[PDB]
């Protein structure tokens, strides 16, 4: 239903994945973003400045080791033809859910970060 409405992963669980990662603000949202990463089906919008924000259809699949790759499909308005597929490890996926919190955090509105979109149509080659 909302971001903030989603329960957090346990400690156990997620102060196992904390030291692969940057150990600062990301720790805050780590337990909420894990939580996410394991739901594998999202739903989730693009926001464009001067624009309108879209809405996208994404899923994946996971695993518990922070060292394997995850595949990701994602579809933009609900078109077969928009389809993306994007592989890339878990330790870098998770920091991408982690900013889409940040950007949760400071606007209050589900809205994906703009470099997810850069790796995901592959403008870094």
Known sequence: MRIDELVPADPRAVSLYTPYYSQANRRRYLPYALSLYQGSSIEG???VEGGAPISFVATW????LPADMTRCHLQFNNDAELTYEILLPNHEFLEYLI???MGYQRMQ??????AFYRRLLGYDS
């Open 45 to 47: 919008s693009r926001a």
């Open 61 to 64: 699949t996971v695993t518990p």
């Open 99 to 101: 900013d889409m919190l």
């Open 109 to 114: 509105k589900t809205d994906f970060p703009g």
